[PDB]
Subunit: 147 residues, 2 copies
């Protein structure tokens, strides 16, 4: 049961951390309005992306536009359509979702856990937090102890 346990723990870590980022963004919108708030999202994303187990965080608005990313090498993504079904699902239903992907960052295809949590202000979706998290770390550490 160790694999299940460590994977659940990893995913719980990511989702609770991500819930706090969502709360933070909501509160900046509450306090400042959309125009002046959208300018503080980058700093919050950058803070939270300094967690070890997070490969990337993006913030995507109601119209599926990538408003901010934490990975500098992805700066050309800003103002592009996310074109992402899981993001669209999160925006439409107002509910979080997740899936596993395989992604090559330059080391070979790695298992990555994608987590989406929509941001709600006054109960309406304003955007979505998209997180790539390095769940392969858990797989590796299980492999290291032959579990």
């Amino acid at each position: 049961n160790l694999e299940k346990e460590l994977l659940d723990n990893f995913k719980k870590n990511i989702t609770q951390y991500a819930k706090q980022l969502e709360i933070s963004i909501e509160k900046v919108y509450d306090e400042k309005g959309s125009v002046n708030a959208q300018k503080d999202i980058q700093n919050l994303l950058s803070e939270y992306a300094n967690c070890q187990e997070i490969g990337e965080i993006r913030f995507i608005d109601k119209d599926q536009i990538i408003i901010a990313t934490t990975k500098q090498s992805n700066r050309s993504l800003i103002n592009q359509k996310a074109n992402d079904s899981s993001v669209q699902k999160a925006l439409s239903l107002g509910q979080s979702n997740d899936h596993l992907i395989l992604k090559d960052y330059g080391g070979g295809k790695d298992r990555v856990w994608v987590y989406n949590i929509p941001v709600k202000v006054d109960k309406k979706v304003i955007g979505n937090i998209y997180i790539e998290s390095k769940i392969n770390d858990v797989y590796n550490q299980l492999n290291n102890i032959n579990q």
Copy 2:
């Protein structure tokens, strides 16, 4: 409630991982006796110490002799008495225990979580697994998101 959640998740990772180590050592004892399974323990501790969040693992026998360490800087600890109250408590109660310490590994005093879990064969304590774990990482992560 995020600080409590992340601290709890961290401790759950360490304890579930340590339970698998405890199982592994017990099974080597089971199969090979104690005069043929007291030389493979080191390899199991060395595998488990690849966990990036563990600072050290020690295995300590019934008579409180440090049998094995994963820290090369601490080889001289081997064959000495542990002289540790929490280890004594785990051996005598036959249950796990834990406490926080401050330890300076070279970078200043860091918060470290110490976890003990006794090893039981034939329902008797034959020893104890002592773990120092890098819970400081969690505090730092919290401080980086102002939580």
